[PDB]
Amino acid sequence: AGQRPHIMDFTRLRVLNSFFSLMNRSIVNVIEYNQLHSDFPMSPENQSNYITNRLLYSLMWGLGGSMGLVERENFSKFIQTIAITPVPANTIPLLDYSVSIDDANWSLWKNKVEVETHKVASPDVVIPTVDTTRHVDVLHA
Amino acid sequence: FLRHAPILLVDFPSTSSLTQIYGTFNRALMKLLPNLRSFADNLTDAMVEFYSESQKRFTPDIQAHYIYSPRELSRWDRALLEAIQTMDGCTLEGLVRLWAHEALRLFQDRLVETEEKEWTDKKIDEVALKHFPSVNLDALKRPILYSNWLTKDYQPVNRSDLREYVKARLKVFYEEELDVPLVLFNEVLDHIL
């Protein structure tokens, strides 16, 4: 991630923080995920899948967030080949995928829309799309 | 500073994302024109294709203010909407000529060299005719103007009917303000509007 060119000088701590901030959100996600399913708390086996996968997720957005649009894609694929754990084929960038807080699986973002005649292209109305719902998750953490 | 600040690069909505993003705004905009509700997707393509084609033709190199983005599309849509909402029923012909207008005032009014402005015009039609075959070509006939200081609502006006008017309304500006005998010529009109 360091060898790769970013839009703003690569600095060890910056990306790690972006990563840590994301990696932590993955953790908190499970922290509250149980404050809801008190009767159906998380699970040792399933939780293992989420964290293991989410980490890979944070890496590309935390260490590659400042990367170009095209550049970022290659980076995500580099994280796939390495990832010993279950990961989709290189036929589709890992950047296009996310991770279900439930079954903890590489579910393509594409799976996540009506405007009102008087309020067409207006300030508020933000037509949701891949990029849209995708950047949100990262901006949340 | 950056050490504490995580970055997130944001480019332009992929050509695909725009046709779905701004493409929708139209499919909902064409409800004010049920008769043309069968051209929604068409309007979209022509809108995104023209925008894209231009963003490249005019890079920040040839000049500074030559910067584009989806924001132009919104100003384009909001423009299409605001105009439609004030017409007792529009037609395939009206849409195109109204479509070209907003396209001009957005990607042409910023150009400098006539060579560039000239290009913009031939392209605007090339795309219009490419997406709207059933059009009455004359609907894109220049000069394209739109004024409401004459017609009841927002309707097209010819140089004459317009200048012959502004000239009269101008006669008042003379004694009520600065007596600057202005020569209402081509360019002058394009600006006042």
Cα separation, B99 vs B33, in Å, equals 14
Q: Which residue of A has its CA nearest to B73?
A: A121
Q: Which two tokens stand for residue B190?
A: 């394009």
Cα separation, B63 vs B91, in Å, equals 37
Contact A19, A62 (CB under 8 A): yes
Which residues, at least 6 apart from B24, have a Cβ–Cβ distance to it below 8 Å?
Answer: A113, A114, A115, A127
Considering CB atoms only, which of B3, B76, B77 is closest to A11?
A: B3
Closest C-alpha among B168, B140, B44 to residue A121: B44
* Helices marked H in chain B: 15-29, 40-57, 70-84, 92-107, 114-131, 159-176, 186-192
Residue B93 φ/ψ, nearest 5 degrees: -70, -50
The rounded Cα A49 to chain-centroid distance in angstroms is 15
Closest C-alpha among A55, A98, A127, A32 to residue B25: A127
Q: How many CA atoms lie within 13 A of A103 on its CB side?
A: 3
The torsion region of residue B65 among left (phi > 0), alpha (psi -120 to 50) and beta comes to: alpha
Query: Measured between alpha carbons, how far is residue B191 from residues B18, B105, B184, B185 in Å?
Result: 31, 10, 11, 10
Contact A107, A98 (CB under 8 A): yes
Strand, coil or helix: B146: strand
For residue B119, count CB atoms less than 10 angstroms from its CB and return exposed for 0-12, middle for 13-18, buried for 19 or more.
middle
Alpha carbon of B28: minimum distance to chain A alpha carbons (Å):
5
Contact B112, B42 (CB under 8 A): no
Contact A28, A67 (CB under 8 A): no
User: How open is the CA angle A81-A86-A91, to the nearest 5 degrees?
Assistant: 50
Q: Which two tokens stand for residue B69?
A: 């983005």
The CATH number covering residue B179 comes to: 1.20.920.30
CB neighbourhood size of A133 (10 A): 14
For residue A44, count CB atoms less than 10 angstroms from its CB and return exposed for 0-12, middle for 13-18, buried for 19 or more.
exposed
The residue whose two tokens read 């086996």 is A45
User: How open is the CA angle B141-B144-B146, to the nearest 5 degrees?
Assistant: 140
Interface contact A121-B73, CB threshold 8 A:
yes
Closest C-alpha among A105, A103, A95, A91 to residue A137: A95
The torsion region of residue A24 among left (phi > 0), alpha (psi -120 to 50) and beta comes to: alpha
Which residues, at least 6 apart from B5, have a Cβ–Cβ distance to it below 8 Å?
Answer: A14
CB neighbourhood size of A12 (10 A): 9
Run of H or E residues at B156: strand B155-156
Considering CB atoms only, which of A11, A130, A139 is closest to B8?
A: A139
Handedness of CA B52, B56, B61, B66 (dihedral sign): negative
Residue ranges making up the domain that contains B114: 13-193
Residue of A117, A120, A136 to mutate for B, most B C-beta atoms under 10 A: A120
Q: What is the resolution of this structure in A?
A: 3.8
The residue whose two tokens read 């360019």 is B187
**Chain A contact set for B25 (CB, 8 A):** 115, 120-121, 127
Cα separation, B182 vs B71, in Å, equals 35
Peptide bond into B70 cis (omega under 30): no
Q: Which two tokens stand for residue A109?
A: 């973002």
**Chain A contact set for B7 (CB, 8 A):** 6-8, 14, 18, 65-66
